[PDB]
């Protein structure tokens, strides 16, 4: 037996390929399916990706956003079926895989340390020019 | 012991 393959076989039903690639430091918007008492609506969450912990189907990622004065961190399974879609808002450039340190930075300090990732901004704009 |  190959035990690793069997887990990968159980997981294949639930893997997604519709979601666009992103990186810690990018600003991202997650359109997320929510249940509010009776109905179920779609609530968008937009902030900076601070962490991506990889494990194949079990990979997750963490988004941080300020909301009416308070910091809110929100953790998302990458292959969650509740995620309607993910839309890139901005490419940022980090120098390390985890961005915990920005929790202690001012707004200006963050801006100066996570600058636009012009190289990948170009790759996005280069594509999407599909015809 | 200090049995005092």
């Amino acid at each position: 037996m190959n035990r690793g393959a069997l887990i990968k076989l159980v997981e294949s039903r639930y893997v997604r390929t519709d979601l666009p690639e992103f990186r810690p430091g990018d600003t991202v918007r997650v359109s997320y399916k929510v249940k509010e008492g009776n109905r179920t609506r779609i609530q968008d969450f937009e902030g900076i990706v601070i962490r991506i912990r990889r494990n194949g189907f079990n990979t997750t990622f963490t988004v941080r956003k300020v909301s009416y004065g308070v910091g809110v961190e929100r953790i998302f399974p990458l292959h969650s079926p509740l995620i309607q879609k993910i839309d890139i808002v901005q490419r940022g450039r980090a120098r390390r895989a985890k961005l915990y340190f920005i929790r202690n930075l001012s707004d200006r300090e963050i801006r100066r340390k996570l600058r636009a990732d012009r190289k990948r901004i170009d790759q996005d704009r280069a594509a999407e020019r599909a015809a | 012991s200090e049995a005092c």
């Binding site: 037996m1 035990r3 690793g4 069997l6 887990i7 076989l9 159980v10 997981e11 039903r13 639930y14 399916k33 249940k35 189907f57 079990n58 399974p77 969650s80 079926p81 509740l82 | -």
Partner: protein, 204 residues
Amino acid sequence: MKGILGVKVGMTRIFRDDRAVPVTVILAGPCPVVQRRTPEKDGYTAVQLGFLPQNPKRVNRPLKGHFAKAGVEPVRILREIRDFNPEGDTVTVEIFKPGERVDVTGTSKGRGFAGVMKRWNFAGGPDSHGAHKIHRHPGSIGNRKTPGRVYKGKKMAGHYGAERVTVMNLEVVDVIPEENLLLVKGAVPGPNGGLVIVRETKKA
């Protein structure tokens, strides 16, 4: 009452109705029947099951004779499931349907010689305020001249884990007949690659 011999594979979580469901994946069957314990012969009702094929050049003559009376290949493991007389001569995952509750028996992980804090959740001693080399010690173990001794079954240090453990009433999340797979919500005793026994539940 029905059961099967399995292999613990690993853990994952699937999604069912917008909820995350942790699971343990178990490679249960297929288990051929090798011998039947009858009240006329042995005194009780059970099935002896085989599991995992074995190198026939690795199974001595006493065991080969046993496999020959049932006309089966050599199997690595032989275990009995009591009070189960299946119709066929082979037992596969399809005796379980999704939604049934099962009990699973495996051999827990072995901590070797375990201190009383890890073995029995004792409180140890303080870590400052004068505490003198008793930081993880059991404390007192008795009284004085009456009874002048220590109770049997006293909780003390010693080996821990690598013991038979059954967890009971686990929900079967899915069955995949094509791969001899059995999904089960929650945690199962032992390490990945450990043998496990899956039985229909006894909680009503």
